[PDB]
């Protein structure tokens, strides 16, 4: 839900998100 909602409804990564979106890989791509 975080990647599919937070950056979908408001695609404003930087104002409304952070670089930790790459850390999503560390929780999804890594595992």
């Amino acid at each position: 839900a975080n990647w599919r909602e937070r950056s979908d409804l408001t695609v404003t990564v930087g104002i409304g998100n952070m670089n930790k979106d790459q850390q999503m890989l560390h929780l999804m791509r890594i595992w």
Binding site: W3, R4, S7, V13, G14, N19, D21, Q22, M24, L25, L27, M28, R29
Partner: protein, 36 residues
């Protein structure tokens, strides 16, 4: 989707080290040194 997000992070919003294209390259080098 995580790889897509990582690629967006590496491609988009990755111009921070260049000061967002150096703020239009110092605003066109002070508008061509404000003289011609």
């Amino acid at each position: 989707q995580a790889d897509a997000q990582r690629a967006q992070s590496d491609a988009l919003a990755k111009q921070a080290e260049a000061q967002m294209k150096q703020v239009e390259a110092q605003i066109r080098l002070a508008e061509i040194e404000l003289k011609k």
